């Protein structure tokens, strides 16, 4: 599953910052070593206080979660 989709989500001053980078990997069980950079993608001036986070999935999926 080479499409490794890394994302960073931040809600600062009523703005949503999205950083992403799609890179080809071959280690799905764990996170491969190395270095990369995530580029700014979208700025969303919403104004919502986000305290909970829920992934939306299609239904008739292994992922990772850290904190900054």
């Amino acid at each position: 599953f080479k499409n490794l989709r890394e994302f960073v989500f931040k809600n600062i001053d009523g703005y949503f910052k999205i950083y992403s980078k799609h890179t080809p990997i071959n280690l799905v069980r764990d996170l491969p070593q190395g270095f990369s950079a995530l580029e700014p993608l979208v700025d969303l001036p919403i104004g919502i206080n986000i305290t909970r986070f829920q992934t939306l999935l299609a239904l008739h999926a292994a992922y990772y979660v850290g904190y900054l």
């Binding site: 001053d13 009523g14 104004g47 206080n49």
Partner: protein, 47 residues
Amino acid sequence: KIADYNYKLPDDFTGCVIAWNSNNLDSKGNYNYLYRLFRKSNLKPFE
């Protein structure tokens, strides 16, 4: 009450506030227009 519960501004707010008197366009006793009077904490900016 207003600065903390109804509309909260950042303390570094670089902006302008414009007030339009509308006694002829909003007054009735118009009850549909309220204000927030009580709250346990202070609002965040853009909340």
